[PDB]
Amino acid sequence: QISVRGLAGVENVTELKKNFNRHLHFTLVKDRNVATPRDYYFALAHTVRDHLVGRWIRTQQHYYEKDPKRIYYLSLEFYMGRTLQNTMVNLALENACDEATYQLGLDMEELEEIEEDAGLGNGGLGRLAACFLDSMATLGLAAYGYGIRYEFGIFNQKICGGWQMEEADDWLRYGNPWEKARPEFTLPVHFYGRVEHTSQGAKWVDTQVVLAMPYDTPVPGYRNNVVNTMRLWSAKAPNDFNLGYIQAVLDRNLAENISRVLYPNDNFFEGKELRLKQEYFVVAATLQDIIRRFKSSTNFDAFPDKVAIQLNDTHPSLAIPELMRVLVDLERLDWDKAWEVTVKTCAYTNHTVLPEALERWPVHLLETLLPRHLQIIYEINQRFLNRVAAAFPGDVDRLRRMSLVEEGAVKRINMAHLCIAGSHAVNGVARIHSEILKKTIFKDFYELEPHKFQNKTNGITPRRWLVLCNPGLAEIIAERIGEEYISDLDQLRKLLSYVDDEAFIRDVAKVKQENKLKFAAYLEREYKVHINPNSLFDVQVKRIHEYKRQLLNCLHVITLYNRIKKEPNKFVVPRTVMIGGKAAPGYHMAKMIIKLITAIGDVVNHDPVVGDRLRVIFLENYRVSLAEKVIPAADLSEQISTAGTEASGTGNMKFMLNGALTIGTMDGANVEMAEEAGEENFFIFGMRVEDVDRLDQRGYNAQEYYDRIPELRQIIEQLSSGFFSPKQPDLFKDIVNMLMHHDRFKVFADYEEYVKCQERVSALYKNPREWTRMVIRNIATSGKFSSDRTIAQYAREIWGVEPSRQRLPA
Numbered sequence: 001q002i003s004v005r006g007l008a009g010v011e012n013v014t015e016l017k018k019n020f021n022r023h024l025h026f027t028l029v030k031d032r033n034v035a036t037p038r039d040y041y042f043a044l045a046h047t048v049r050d051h052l053v054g055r056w057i058r059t060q061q062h063y064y065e066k067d068p069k070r071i072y073y074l075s076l077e078f079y080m081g082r083t084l085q086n087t088m089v090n091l092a093l094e095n096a097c098d099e100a101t102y103q104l105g106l107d108m109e110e111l112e113e114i115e116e117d118a119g120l121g122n123g124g125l126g127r128l129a130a131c132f133l134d135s136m137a138t139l140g141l142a143a144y145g146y147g148i149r150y151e152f153g154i155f156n157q158k159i160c161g162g163w164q165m166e167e168a169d170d171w172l173r174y175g176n177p178w179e180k181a182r183p184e185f186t187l188p189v190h191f192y193g194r195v196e197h198t199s200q201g202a203k204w205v206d207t208q209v210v211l212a213m214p215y216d217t218p219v220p221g222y223r224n225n226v227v228n229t230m231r232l233w234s235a236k237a238p239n240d241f242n243l244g245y246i247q248a249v250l251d252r253n254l255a256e257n258i259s260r261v262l263y264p265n266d267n268f269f270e271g272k273e274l275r276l277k278q279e280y281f282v283v284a285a286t287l288q289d290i291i292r293r294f295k296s297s298t299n300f301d302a303f304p305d306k307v308a309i310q311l312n313d314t315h316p317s318l319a320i321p322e323l324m325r326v327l328v329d330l331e332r333l334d335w336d337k338a339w340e341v342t343v344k345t346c347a348y349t350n351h352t353v354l355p356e357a358l359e360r361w362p363v364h365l366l367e368t369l370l371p372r373h374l375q376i377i378y379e380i381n382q383r384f385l386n387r388v389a390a391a392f393p394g395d396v397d398r399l400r401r402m403s404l405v406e407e408g409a410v411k412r413i414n415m416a417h418l419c420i421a422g423s424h425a426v427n428g429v430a431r432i433h434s435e436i437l438k439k440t441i442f443k444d445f446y447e448l449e450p451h452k453f454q455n456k457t458n459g460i461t462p463r464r465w466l467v468l469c470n471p472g473l474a475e476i477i478a479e480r481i482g483e484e485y486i487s488d489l490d491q492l493r494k495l496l497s498y499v500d501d502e503a504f505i506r507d508v509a510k511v512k513q514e515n516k517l518k519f520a521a522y523l524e525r526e527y528k529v530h531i532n533p534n535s536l537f538d539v540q541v542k543r544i545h546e547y548k549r550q551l552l553n554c555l556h557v558i559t560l561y562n563r564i565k566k567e568p569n570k571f572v573v574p575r576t577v578m579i580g581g582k583a584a585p586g587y588h589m590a591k592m593i594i595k596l597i598t599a600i601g602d603v604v605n606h607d608p609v610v611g612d613r614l615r616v617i618f619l620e621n622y623r624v625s626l627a628e629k630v631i632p633a634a635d636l637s638e639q640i641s642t643a644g645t646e647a648s649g650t651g652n653m654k655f656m657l658n659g660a661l662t663i664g665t666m667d668g669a670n671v672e673m674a675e676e677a678g679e680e681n682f683f684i685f686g687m688r689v690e691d692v693d694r695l696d697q698r699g700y701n702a703q704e705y706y707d708r709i710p711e712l713r714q715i716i717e718q719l720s721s722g723f724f725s726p727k728q729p730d731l732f733k734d735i736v737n738m739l740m741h742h743d744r745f746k747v748f749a750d751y752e753e754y755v756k757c758q759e760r761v762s763a764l765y766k767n768p769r770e771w772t773r774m775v776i777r778n779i780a781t782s783g784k785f786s787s788d789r790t791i792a793q794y795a796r797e798i799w800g801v802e803p804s805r806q807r808l809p810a
């Protein structure tokens with residue numbers, strides 16, 4: 001069909017078809033008379049999977065022979081999404097499989113929709129890890145993703161009566177063809193117990209044991225025959241466990257609950273024991289696995305030369321004291337030597353500055369669950385503060401500010417401080433975020449060790465986020481500049497010379513229109529809700545959170561609605577406002593925001609006077625698979641977090657690469673995106689970080705904005721009076737009260753500039769040709785945001801390894 005999807009060779013299409021039938025028969029035990037679409041999906045999945053194994057085996061054999069430095073990316077989240085299409089794209093099998101299934105009388109797209117999303121992540125943090133794995137494989141790095149195989153990933157979101165309802169994500173229900181259980185590599189993990197101090201060294205004894213069973217998932221690089229591994233641990237109770245008989249067996253559930261479910265919090269720390277167990281479980285199993293692999297390749301001096309451990313935020317921070325524990329207690333290295341190795345091995349990436357998101361574990365929890373680790377942490381702190389005291393003599397406050405131990409109601413361990421002390425590199429995920437780290441939260445640490453601090457702006461993989469979800473766009477681009485850009489996104493700059501090309505302008509616009517038509521259709525297919533494909537698609541999809549300000553978007557929507565009702569026969573650019581995202585189950589305000597959005601839709605979508613001029617739709621169950629559908633269809637990308645709160649954002653990059661213009665604040669990566677494309681080609685508005693600080697010093701008083709802005713006042717009064725909730729007039733009292741008296745995110749402060757900026761957007765949309773030309777200017781300069789660039793920087797500036805675009809013999 002299309003170029004970038006590879007060749008549909010005669011021999012390969014024939015081979016695919018027979019292997020497809022082979023699996024349908026021998027693997028699924030079905031014939032064409034009783035096979036269902038799901039059976040066909042699995043038959044295709046196994047057929048494609050077969051093509052991975054050969055490459056997987058030799059890639060691993062290759063690393064064993066050459067023994068390069070290994071990169072271990074530790075994360076409690078990996079938001080992988082679907083694997084079938086991504087695998088075909090990276091193996092250049094898409095057209096062949098498309099043809100083969102066509103000849104078998106099947107629609108491959110229909111089959112791809114059957115695959116369950118692997119949702120082992122909450123959002124941006126987990127998705128970044130997924131993009132990173134893809135890029136590390138594409139750049140030929142000997143990298144391993146290590147995490148937890150949650151039985152239940154992020155919950156599926158159902159909207160009932162306008163409210164979010166959660167339901168278990170039983171993603172393993174029908175089985176997972178992409179994972180290979182490796183029970184032979186099961187490792188023991190210890191919990192509780194006590195510390196015994198003997199003649200030579202301390203011993204952690206009387207512990208309760210849980211087994212960690214690994215499951216390996218292949219991670220194919222883009223057309224380079226490299227297939228790396230993502231190893232996820234599953235909790236298994238030992239057999240002598242708790243060994244009435246029946247009860248003892250049933251109580252195994254206790255130990256195995258460790259890998260049962262993903263905590264559904266985004267940018268929010270919940271200090272529960274189960275979560276701490278998950279964090280140690282992944283770290284303990286991973287480190288033993290890492291050391292085992294190393295001992296094959298006694299003098300750990302070379303450990304840092306053969307191993308790099310990247311901590312995805314502080315979630316796996318226990319890797320530092322655990323590594324010390326193993327080196328000191330088990331390998332018997334002197335403290336100083338062990339510490340040197342640990343620091344040179346570990347690197348930490350911070351993904352937030354929000355106080356409620358930082359991990360601060362109660363000492364009493366670590367005391368009971370991990371007694372030896374607590375001792376090691378105290379020793380680390382003791383030695384670290386001695387260093388601080390020597391550098392800043394007499395500065396007693398600095399000592400208490402930098403301590404890993406926070407005093408107060410209950411003593412807590414600041415995991416971020418632990419990570420900085422035990423890592424040779426600490427990085428932010430966007431230039432502005434990394435600067436904020438050095439100027440605020442980690443200022444004291446930056447002053448003590450400036451060399452440790454770096455920036456590594458986030459990125460997204462152009463394979464899944466362009467080629468896979470937007471083949472039409474990838475095609476028209478390849479037509480003009482070739483296919484090299486897929487693994488070298490910077491080449492998109494060449495598209496700048498086509499900004500005045502009438503043919504190109506027309507094609508870019510045509511692809512967008514086709515995507516919108518396809519999405520508009522999907523909305524009626526699976527969700528039954530009519531929308532106008534000619535309207536501007538205004539979308540904000542991301543987790544529901546106060547800092548992301550879906551509420552600001554809501555205020556604008558209501559403003560648009562009120563303006564139409566005031567002057568019905570006045571022309572306005574038609575818009576379809578789409579907002580989607582999940583709210584953490586225990587985040588009340590977030591759940592109220594979802595209700596507000598659907599409530600606004602209830603009024604707006606049924607008002608005769610509005611017609612098809614304005615529609616408000618809440619995209620149910622936003623997840624990776626849905627993102628792949630809506631992003632390519634978007635015209636306007638909403639990235640409106642309060643300046644200084646969105647560490648980076650990555651959804652923003654996805655929209656930019658897919659032909660949507662961006663309306664946003666100078667926050668996170670938005671700053672660099674505007675810088676790359678040019679501010680004239682971006683819709684920037686609102687306070688900058690400095691303005692937010694100025695307002696805080698003075699004191700934020702929402703009442704002021706309410707008193708000076710009639711349109712804003714009207715909206716608040718509509719919310720308070722029950723205009724959007726007739727049966728329950730005071731339904732949104734909490735929202736109004738928050739907005740008026742304790743809005744940490746200054747929604748009102750950016751309201752005027754936001755509405756004004758939105759008017760500029762509507763003005764440009766009225767001129768199809770110029771809107772599209774600006775779009776081309778965005779797509780052409782999105783190259784910097786490829787995770788290949790990000791990973792190349794991590795590789796050279798932190799891990800000390802050189803990326804390679806060399807194909808392996810397949």
Ligand SMILES: *Cc1c(COP(=O)(O)O)cnc(C)c1O
Binds near residue numbers: 122541650
């Ligand atoms: C990319 C992505 C995110 C991150 O979006 P932001 O707007 O940066 O918060 C969250 N969820 C999903 C499913 C994603 O694909």
